[PDB]
Design a protein around this nucleic acid. Structure first.
Ligand SMILES: [K+]
Ligand SMILES: [K+]
Ligand SMILES: [K+]
Ligand SMILES: [K+]
Ligand SMILES: [K+]
Ligand SMILES: [K+]
Ligand SMILES: [Mg+2]
Ligand SMILES: [Mg+2]
Ligand SMILES: [Mg+2]
Ligand SMILES: [Mg+2]
Ligand SMILES: [Mg+2]
Ligand SMILES: [Mg+2]
Ligand SMILES: [Mg+2]
Ligand SMILES: [Mg+2]
Ligand SMILES: [Mg+2]
Ligand SMILES: [Mg+2]
Ligand SMILES: [Mg+2]
Ligand SMILES: [Mg+2]
Ligand SMILES: [Mg+2]
Ligand SMILES: [Mg+2]
Ligand SMILES: [Mg+2]
Ligand SMILES: [Mg+2]
Ligand SMILES: [Mg+2]
Ligand SMILES: [Mg+2]
Ligand SMILES: [Mg+2]
Ligand SMILES: [Mg+2]
Lengths: 132, 128, 16, 567, 81, 50, 101, 49, 327
RNA sequence: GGACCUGGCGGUGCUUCAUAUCCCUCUAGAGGAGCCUGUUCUGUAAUCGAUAAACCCCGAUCAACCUCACCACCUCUUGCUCAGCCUAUAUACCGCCAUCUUCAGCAAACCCUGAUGAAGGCUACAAAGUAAGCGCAAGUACCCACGUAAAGACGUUAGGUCAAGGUGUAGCCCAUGAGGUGGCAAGAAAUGGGCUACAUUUUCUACCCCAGAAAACUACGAUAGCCCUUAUGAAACUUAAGGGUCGAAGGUGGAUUUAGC
């Protein structure tokens, strides 16, 4: 039986998001990609470097906004701009979200030597697609 | 390696071993069982070992109408914070350890005679 | 069970 | 593209939970974001090796770590110059002393570059991220200056300017005498500081101060030194104290600027505007000074020339409100909207004051149909309103007889951080309950009064005893009756006794009309029972009304007799 | 201000609403490039353009006056370099 | 802007590759992946450098 | 802080190979022609053989950059098949999808 | 550069700006192993001496 | 009294959309419809649903292969599933006398049909099909079994066999869905004229990876040119020439038309097949309608869909498996 | 010990089935020969894992050094790491999978029957079942609505993998860790899979299908052996390519067995 990225059926009490509910074969069919860049197009270079950067940015934001992320990150690159779009919860005070936005944008801009912007969308609770 | 690190959920699912041929048929018994613990429970965003005070994250942003600057707790002032977190951690462990004992039934290991409470309220605002 | 089982509002714009 | 009126300023996160909901959060959210940036820069500069991998092409110099430490550890002149560029006051002094004790020669240009550093900061270390008069009597600057072997004009100039900057006015004038005794010539910048010292050195009458300044200016012409913009701007800034005495002298400086060829900046008019805007009747003079200043500035794009250029608009709007001239305010705002003049508005404190006086003048002197266009364009896009402007807005709706908008102002007030303002909720309720209205409007006023009631009930001062003003309780109850929510009105009567608040005469009379319609004698007695507790004179007359109007049961008749016994 | 929905719906369900919708966040939207905006943008960019010579009406005429052709290529990719 | 533009769609490229599905052994069981590259070509003519 | 000691050895091999690349290139040029005397080429053979063993580029191994797996690595992403799939199967690799045809 | 990534994020954890859930997990397992008597020996003072 | 853990969360259940919800969703769609029209600079009054779908595809471009997962801004009626209304009032009395059957709509329909069959007794195909169960389940707004569907259909057929009048015919047509029959008749290419005024037709054909384009002239001597070469020089294999002969021979027109065709891709046999199909399609312009139907029934106008199958991983070929190792 | 129920099993009955499918039928193979490659066994100072179906060109889309985890010798001890360990345990696990599956079932919450026993719950001219959710299905990918992919729940074999990485438990910490130098990986044999053959529907050349020669001890047949050159590399009796020499078994393969609509 296939296991990869499959949330398994339970008793109907496990809330899953839209992303978690779709196995890999639905990628590009029912769900899109979480990162968009040109490195994986035919005739394009530097796919390895973009991939490592994406793995770091996902771990960095998970630990920088602990318990606040309500879904996976969406990473967008246009030219040298890096846009991080995150859906977060409404538990932390707004002052702490502004501190971490200023802190994260600045630290990441100096780390990867590019203008980095962080876009936060707040939700009252994790959006539930279905109960498995 | 930083890239070999996993999330807390992944680490507990592995360590607990709740899914497996051991837990399928109760092939494994648990006199000693790994118990899940939430390690982010008493943790404050912005608090680290070095004891830095970040205005707007772990200390107030404005003090006396003026914006606070970056500061660091003294070595002694930081020891107290660390000790206080350990005591707060043992207090939490003791609060969970303090659980009200329920009366026994016909015998200590018997279910017979134990009260289960009133039946659940029916859908149409019925109560028992 | 006999040891015990102890697993154990208003909103405002611009709060303070 | 133009400004988006439904949005808060671009610096804020465009999210309803993260958008600022008040002027206080507007300031604090930006300070919290700036704090995070400083924490990042502190880390970047503390651990630069983590941020040294440069993968950017082309190279980005502004995204690399900064090194604030000297890398030359030899003791020599070329190593001192490094500590002067980094602005290390103590290290540079120590390096200068050791270099001097060893007997090596330190150039003059370098010795001056050390004074510019000490004289500017006052022999104190500039602020860093993390590790009265201020011209210290024991200061390295004076010592090095004395030990100096050869002293040029530049050496004295930096000593005189530093003293004036740190408020050592008397010492700076004494040093200006030696410069003349030594047959030296000062620069314009030194003269600018000496003009400030002449006025601030001692307290004297204007005529005495005005004679010294004219002597400095004539000395500036003897030494073939040409005055700059700051020379004339310092004179006007220093004449602020004398007010009426300096009004005509100040206008002599401005006319001289035009002739000489120096162009007045925004600061030049800010100082003149502040000088003429003394407490008193502004109509006599201030009226025609601001009218002529705006005709001159009409359709002019401004460039930064003086540090005080970001104060003209705040000063100019302040007089238009005082004069109560709305056409002048539009011209001032028109000047702010020509080209890139919007950048001279000033810091956040000046931006909110400018828009507060501007909008408060619109609500007063402008038609209500246009007032609501500015209300939509300015708030919250341009600034968050103070609770006193919401009141100025309600007073404008009243004068226009447009009270269907009151429930909107309450919704907006909550979204701007005025949910728990007492002066505001009382104002809203009084206007809503001042007079009776058609049934459609009366129902709407009862939906807002209910929401206000909830605000009084769920205040964040709930830890302290809830303060329910008498007017608020009377108005909220009256609005329920006129809307037909009599059940809610009757319940509230208990709160008059709980908080010991006097019931209003109008409320008691309207309660009777709701009883006679329901033909409920008990409720009618409950009204007479309430007024009896407070010993109101209308009660004794009301008891007569209740007798005739309502059938009085024997128990009710005895109850009235009990109140009659109290009478 | 659009009631746009996205997401494969569950049985007897509807596509998910825009609030908290990651699928709509994953899209490279063109909301900044509406036909109204493009036309306003291009009216301001006309002042930066120059006029092609009218004499060069056809490719054969260009070849006559300009016999040399120089081809170069620029590559726009996303990244720091 | 008054520029003459033609458009066409060059043929797409799909790059496929095969990987083992299991961490260990089970050679005959693979997972196949692909990257699809689609093209659009805007051809502008008779325009100045400005 | 590298994944394992074997990745650390390859890190050093890549560092030393980069440092000696020019020296080996120049010496090899002397050995890879029939123009110079054998007496000179025999000396160049000894010179390139005397360089440090880890300067030789054939000893560099393309290991997974996240797991140090020496085989099953896809050069374009420098990831093992297992690590690639984990990212691919969660939609974290731009433009990569499961292939059906 | 696995050094930079590990050292950068380790420094940020000590500064309180990054929560390393994995490291926190390892710290709890190491803490509970001391109370159980399974502590790491001193170098040179191993079970064999 | 004592505590047992609570069984479940009530939200973990199927939802329902009240009438008031749909009423407010329609106000949002109409306001958003005017916003979207303002975004695209179009008249909000004449803004149709086709315009909305086009504007949403531009503003929110999605390449997801399944259209149902793409951004959509439709009228709530289209989006939200139809909801059965309350089946009783405030007093609790069901509205329909067959409520307690659980299938009141289905049994009310059977009751109406059974009653009509009785009244008739007291009184006394190609273009249409019966609706499918999934369409009956929507007219009734109920769930049906397969046997429930059959029993209803068996009862309608029993109603056609009777002397049903006009009133008994409008009712049956409510459950007859027109079945559209596709025309198999071959489309005829237009007859063009060249510079010299000779009538000709042009068509195309595909076989495997071979693609052919043939020009058949109305009058000729039987010359066939393949990429400028005589067909017997281009096709030295006799079977490839037999394929070129088949279309003309089958209609008795050998030596009556000239052909100039171009073919690329595939092998020798695949190219001959593509030319056969291209020539036959073009030849249909010069034969009678009955002859075109005879060519169709002979397989001369059908594109062969048989193309190479992909190899699968874990097996030697498209179908052949690796040897099952000896046990 | 009596009676009953479930499961397993029956050299257990009956009926209907399997569609490249159990047998026969159809086509090309394997089983014999040489070679390539895996495994076993033996050998060696000298890894490990997979190992009935569901291991055996399997982890490896790959081992001359490196890789490497093995052996021998020498060397280091806060050690690339706020150490390390490819040490034990896949019968603690996560992760990723095999298998039935070339299946269609699983199943929460209720309801009812059996006296409220373990248990059971279908009849359409219907007799107690209603069933969310998951799977199938639908939909999507490829050239169609076809086919092929993909998908394929729960569960079965404590199936495979601690040596992808991570990790519980236990163990080592002057060594069970780290580095250096050299070295092993053979074949007395057995066996799996594959390649090339035994030839005339063939062999060689031209051509890419109207040709001329070859055709049994100078034929067909080695991709083997031996010798030489070249390519890659710092390093090649070794790895690959080419040439020369050499011209072997093999003469279409018993029981048995594989694949294909
Ligand atoms: K049995
Ligand atoms: K054989
Ligand atoms: K397992
Ligand atoms: K492992
Ligand atoms: K382990
Ligand atoms: K074989
Ligand atoms: Mg499979
Ligand atoms: Mg006991
Ligand atoms: Mg290699
Ligand atoms: Mg085949
Ligand atoms: Mg054999
Ligand atoms: Mg084994
Ligand atoms: Mg094993
Ligand atoms: Mg087995
Ligand atoms: Mg070695
Ligand atoms: Mg080796
Ligand atoms: Mg070891
Ligand atoms: Mg197992
Ligand atoms: Mg199909
Ligand atoms: Mg398959
Ligand atoms: Mg399916
Ligand atoms: Mg096992
Ligand atoms: Mg060892
Ligand atoms: Mg040979
Ligand atoms: Mg060589
Ligand atoms: Mg021969």
């Amino acid at each position: 039986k296939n296991r990869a990225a499959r949330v398994r059926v339970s008793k109907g009490d496990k809330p899953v998001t839209y992303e978690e509910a779709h196995a890999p074969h639905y990628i590009a069919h029912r769900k899109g990609w979480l990162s968009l860049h040109t490195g994986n197009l035919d005739g394009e270079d530097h796919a390895a470097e973009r991939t490592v950067e994406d793995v770091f940015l996902r771990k960095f934001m998970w630990g920088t906004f602990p318990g606040c992320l309500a879904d996976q990150l969406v990473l967008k690159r246009r030219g040298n701009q890096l846009e991080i779009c995150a859906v977060v919860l409404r538990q932390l005070s707004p002052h702490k979200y502004y501190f971490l936005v200023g802190y994260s944008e600045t630290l990441l801009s100096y780390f990867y030597k590019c203008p980095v912007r962080l876009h936060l969308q707040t939700v009252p609770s994790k959006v539930v697609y279905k109960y498995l | 390696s930083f890239f070999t690190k996993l999330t807390a959920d992944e680490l507990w699912k592995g360590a607990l071993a709740e899914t497996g041929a051991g837990a399928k048929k109760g092939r494994g018994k648990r006199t000693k069982k790994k118990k899940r613990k939430d390690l982010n429970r008493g943790q404050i965003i912005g608090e680290g070992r070095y004891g830095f005070l970040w205005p707007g994250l772990n200390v107030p942003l404005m003090k006396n109408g003026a914006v606070q600057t970056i500061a660091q707790r003294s070595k002694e002032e930081q020891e107290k914070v660390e000790a206080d977190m350990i005591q707060q951690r043992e207090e939490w462990d003791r609060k969970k350890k303090m659980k009200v004992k329920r009366e026994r039934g016909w015998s200590g290991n018997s279910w017979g005679g134990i009260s289960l409470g009133p039946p659940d309220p029916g859908p149409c605002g019925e109560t028992y | 069970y006999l040891s015990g089982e102890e697993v154990e509002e208003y909103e405002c714009y611009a709060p303070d | 593209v133009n400004r988006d009126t439904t949005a808060v300023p671009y610096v804020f996160q465009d999210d309803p939970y993260l958008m600022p909901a008040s002027s206080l959060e507007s300031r604090s959210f930006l300070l919290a974001k700036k704090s995070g940036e400083n924490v990042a820069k502190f880390i970047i500069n503390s651990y630069p090796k983590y941020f040294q991998k440069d993968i950017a092409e082309p190279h980005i110099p502004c995204l690399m770590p900064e090194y604030f430490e000297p890398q030359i550890k030899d003791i020599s002149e070329a190593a001192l110059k490094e500590r002067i560029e980094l602005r290390k006051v103590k290290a540079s002094v120590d390096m200068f002393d050791q270099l001097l004790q060893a007997g090596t020669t330190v150039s003059l240009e370098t010795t001056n570059s050390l004074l510019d550093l000490l004289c500017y900061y006052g022999d104190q270390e500039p602020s860093t991220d993390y590790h009265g008069v201020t011209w210290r009597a024991k200061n390295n600057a004076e010592r090095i200056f004395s030990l100096m072997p050869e002293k040029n004009e530049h050496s004295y100039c930096t000593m005189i300017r530093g003293m004036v900057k740190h408020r050592a006015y008397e010492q700076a004038l004494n040093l200006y005498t030696e410069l003349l005794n030594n047959r030296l010539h000062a620069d314009v910048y030194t003269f600018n500081a000496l003009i400030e010292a002449t006025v601030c050195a001692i307290n004297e009458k204007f005529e005495e101060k005005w004679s010294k300044i004219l002597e400095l200016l004539r000395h500036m012409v003897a030494q073939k030194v040409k005055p700059n913009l700051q020379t004339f701007n310092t004179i006007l800034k220093c004449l602020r104290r004398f007010h009426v005495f300096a009004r005509s002298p100040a206008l002599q400086v401005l006319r001289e600027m035009k002739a000489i060829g120096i162009e007045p900046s925004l600061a030049t008019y800010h100082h003149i505007i502040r000088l003429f805007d003394q407490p008193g009747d502004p109509l006599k003079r201030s009226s025609f000074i601001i009218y002529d200043i705006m005709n001159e500035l009409m359709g002019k794009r401004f460039s930064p020339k003086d540090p005080d250029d970001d104060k003209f608009f705040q000063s100019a709007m302040s007089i238009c409100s005082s004069l109560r001239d709305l056409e002048l305010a539009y011209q001032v705002h028109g000047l702010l909207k020509t080209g890139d003049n919007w950048k001279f508005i000033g810091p956040d404190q000046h931006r909110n004051f400018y828009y507060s006086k501007f909008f408060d003048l619109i609500c007063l002197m402008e038609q209500i149909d246009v007032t609501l266009k500015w209300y939509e364009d300015l708030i919250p896009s341009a600034y968050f309103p103070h609770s006193q402007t919401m009141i100025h807005l309600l007073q404008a709706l009243d004068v226009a007889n447009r009270l269907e908008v009151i429930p909107k102002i309450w919704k907006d007030s909550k979204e701007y951080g005025h949910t728990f303002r007492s002066d505001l909720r009382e104002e809203i309720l009084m206007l809503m309950a001042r007079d009776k209205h058609p049934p459609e409007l009366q129902v709407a006023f009862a939906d807002c009064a209910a929401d206000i009631k909830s605000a009084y009930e769920s205040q964040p001062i709930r830890q302290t005893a809830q303060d329910w003003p008498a007017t608020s309780l009377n108005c909220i109850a009256i609005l329920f009756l006129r809307a037909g929510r009599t059940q809610e009105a009757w319940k509230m009567l208990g709160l008059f006794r709980k908080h010991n608040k006097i019931p209003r005469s109008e409320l008691l009379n309207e309660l009777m009309d709701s009883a006679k319609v329901s033909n409920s004698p008990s409720q009618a007695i409950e009204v007479v029972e309430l007024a009896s507790a407070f010993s109101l004179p209308i009660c004794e007359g009301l008891t007569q009304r209740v007798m005739s109007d309502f059938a009085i049961n024997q128990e009710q008749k005895e109850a009235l007799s009990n109140l009659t016994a109290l009478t | 201000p659009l009631p746009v929905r996205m997401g494969y719906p569950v049985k007897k369900g509807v596509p998910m609403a825009k609030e908290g919708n990651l699928e709509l966040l994953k899209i490279p939207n063109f909301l900044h490039l509406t036909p109204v905006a493009i036309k306003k943008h291009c009216e301001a960019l006309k002042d930066f353009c120059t006029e092609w010579p009218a004499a060069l009406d056809s490719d054969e005429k260009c070849e006559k006056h300009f016999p040399i052709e120089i081809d170069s290529t620029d590559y726009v990719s996303s990244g720091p370099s | 802007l008054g520029i003459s533009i033609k458009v066409h769609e060059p043929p797409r490229k799909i790059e496929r590759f095969t990987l083992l599905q299991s961490v260990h052994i089970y050679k005959k069981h693979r997972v196949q992946y692909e990257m699809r590259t689609l093209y659009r070509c805007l051809e502008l003519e008779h325009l100045t450098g400005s | 802080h590298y994944v394992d000691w074997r990745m650390w050895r390859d890190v050093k091999r890549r560092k030393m190979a980069y440092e000696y690349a020019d020296e080996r290139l120049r010496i090899n040029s002397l050995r890879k022609n029939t123009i110079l005397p054998k007496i000179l080429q025999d000396v160049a053979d000894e010179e390139i053989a005397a360089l440090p063993r880890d300067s030789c580029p054939v000893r560099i191994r393309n290991r997974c950059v996240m797991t140090s797996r020496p085989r099953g690595v896809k050069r374009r992403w420098r990831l093992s098949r297992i690590v690639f799939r984990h990212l691919a199967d969660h939609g974290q690799l731009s433009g990569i999808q499961r292939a059906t045809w | 550069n696995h050094h930079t990534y590990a050292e950068l994020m380790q420094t940020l954890r000590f500064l309180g700006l990054y929560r390393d859930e994995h490291q926190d997990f390892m710290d709890e397992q190491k803490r509970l192993k001391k109370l159980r008597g399974k502590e790491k020996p001193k170098k040179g003072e191993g079970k064999r001496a | 009294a004592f505590v047992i853990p609570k069984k479940n969360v009530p939200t973990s259940k199927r939802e329902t959309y009240t009438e008031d919800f749909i009423k407010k969703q329609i106000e949002e769609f109409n306001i958003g419809k005017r916003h979207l029209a303002n975004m695209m600079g179009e008249d909000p009054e004449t803004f149709t649903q086709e315009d909305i779908d086009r504007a949403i595809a531009y503003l929110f471009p999605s390449g997801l292969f399944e259209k149902r997962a793409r951004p959509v801004m439709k009228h709530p009626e289209q989006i939200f599933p139809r909801q059965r209304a309350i089946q009783w009032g405030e007093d609790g009395r069901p509205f329909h006398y067959l409520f307690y059957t659980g299938k009141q709509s289905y049994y009310s329909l059977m009751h109406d049909v059974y009653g009509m069959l009785l009244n008739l007794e007291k009184h006394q195909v190609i273009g249409s099909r019966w609706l499918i169960k999934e369409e009956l389940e929507e007219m009734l707004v109920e769930k049906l079994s397969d046997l429930d569907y059959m029993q209803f259909i068996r009862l309608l057929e029993k109603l056609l066999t009777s002397q049903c009048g006009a009133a008994e015919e409008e009712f049956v047509q409510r459950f007859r869905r027109s079945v559209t029959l596709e025309s198999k008749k071959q489309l005829i290419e237009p007859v063009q004229y060249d510079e010299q005024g000779m009538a000709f037709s042009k068509s195309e054909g595909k076989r495997k990876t071979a693609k052919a384009e043939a020009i058949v002239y109305k009058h000729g001597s039987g010359r066939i040119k393949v990429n400028g070469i005589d067909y017997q020089l281009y096709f030295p294999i006799t079977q490839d020439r037999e394929q070129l002969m088949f279309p003309f021979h089958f209609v008795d027109r050998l030596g009556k038309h000239d052909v100039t065709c171009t073919v690329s891709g595939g092998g020798r046999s695949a190219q001959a097949g593509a030319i056969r199909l291209a020539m036959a399609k073009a030849l249909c312009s010069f034969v009678t309608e009955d002859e075109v139907e005879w060519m169709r029934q002979a397989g001369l106008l059908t594109t062969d869909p048989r193309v190479r199958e992909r190899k699968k991983p874990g097996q030697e070929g498209a179908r052949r498996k690796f040897t099952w190792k000896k046990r």
